[PDB]
Amino acid sequence: TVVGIDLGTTYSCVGVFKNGRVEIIANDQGNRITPSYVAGERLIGDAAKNQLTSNPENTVFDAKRLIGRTWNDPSVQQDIKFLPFKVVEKKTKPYIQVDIGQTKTFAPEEISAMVLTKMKETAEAYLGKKVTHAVVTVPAYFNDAQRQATKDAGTIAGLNVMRIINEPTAAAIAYGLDKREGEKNILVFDLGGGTFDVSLLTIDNGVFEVVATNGDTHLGGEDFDQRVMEHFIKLYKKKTGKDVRKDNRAVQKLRREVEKAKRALSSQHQARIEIESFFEGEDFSETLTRAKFEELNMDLFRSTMKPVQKVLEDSDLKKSDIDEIVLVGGSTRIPKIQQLVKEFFNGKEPSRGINPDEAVAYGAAVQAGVLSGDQDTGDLVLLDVCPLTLGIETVGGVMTKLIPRNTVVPTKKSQIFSTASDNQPTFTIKVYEGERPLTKDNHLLGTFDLTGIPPAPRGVPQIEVTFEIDVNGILRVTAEDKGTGNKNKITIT
């Protein structure tokens, strides 16, 4: 069976379509999203990320920033300034050098391969079978090199990447926006852990097109965490006099608490940050209000509107021209974000229902099912049918059908006719092809007579007219006096 994988900058997610529903699969730790992190032993996911504070030089993350790019790419030269691990050119490509005290050099797609191996190892456990096929998502702005590099990361991990799909397109498919009538302008607002992407999608009768894209490559949920961590470190110093910044474990534990507290503030107006051994055996427990969280981050929040205005004016659209707003990324749970977006679109409510950090993985899994042979319902048999309507002329030049259009061949169909006059001694069978009610508007294929009808009043004699089509398309029309056994036939080609 084939799975859907969201391979994100900061977190990755895996889903699958089974028993008429998509299932987002939790990992060994029970988390439905896995950090895109790799760190004597080799660690992948939550374990690797927990090591960052103590061993930054040899903890690899944000490989998606480098994948399928050249060393002299201004984006690469900019990003390597703030990455703690060693990035070196080799044949014009950026390579990551870490200490396993063995030193090793990894291509970005090799780090991504390890992350995909973990997501593959998450789905196999749940399903109880080996996973060999996947639909993998990429940002809409990815070029062929970045798409191929992502394909190669799947191949190294032992997956047949059937399709590579745009992240905004996958989000739209999760909300079933592909299964509506007419044309729709859709904005995708994607605020992830480390990246902000805005995408203007057009859908005209099932067909998706990415009109324009914008955002900020260095804005995400983790920037909101940093602002809160700053606040509580400053406050703890003021409350006590202990500076905590250089205590690896203190910052590690504070980050965990701020992440969970932030998520609670998406549901409630107050959350408690409780650390048990914060610094030198001292406990720390404080309340963070929603109001205080919003105050610390309001300028970051307001900055997400600027790229939204740019995609609109780059695509020659007004706010009014937008039909749907789809929210993607964990950070779009933040009530103030949803409030700002709604305010921006003069009272229009963004689309919600799917957990916004699972939306891309959900949509990937839907397309996965569409290419999955496991979802087999029932088989078809081709029918041989007659493309034309065949019949005979009745009193008044009326078209009486014996073989309707799309009747299956071979066939034998009989209808009973009688005389239109008292002691009528003969019938003329006039064979017609066409759809019109008067035979004058239809095509004559031929005629024959049936003579020697014994005398009787009108409507009393009983004649069976039979139309026979065999395999060759040979039409054979028979008229039989059922009373006597009198017969005549014609064969039309």
Residue numbers in the entry: 29 to 67, 72 to 132, 135 to 527
Which lines from the publication concern this structure?
The ER-localized Hsp70 chaperone BiP plays an important role in protein-folding homeostasis. Like Hsp70s in other compartments, BiP does so by the reversible binding and release of unfolded client proteins, a tightly regulated process that depends on the concentration of active BiP and on the nucleotide bound to it. Our studies suggest that MANF contributes to protein-folding homeostasis in the ER by antagonizing nucleotide exchange on BiP, thus stabilizing certain BiP–client interactions.
Attempts to co-crystalize MANF in complex with BiP in a conformation consistent with client binding were unsuccessful. Nonetheless, the BiP component of the crystallization mix yielded informative crystals (at a resolution of 2.1 Å). Despite a truncation of the C-terminal α-helical lid (28–549) and the presence of a V461F mutation (known to inhibit client binding), in the crystal lattice, BiPV461F molecules were packed with the hydrophobic interdomain linker of one protomer engaged as a conventional client in the SBD of an adjacent protomer. These crystallographic findings fit with MANF’s observed preference for the ADP-bound state of BiP, but suggest that MANF would be excluded from the core of BiP oligomers.
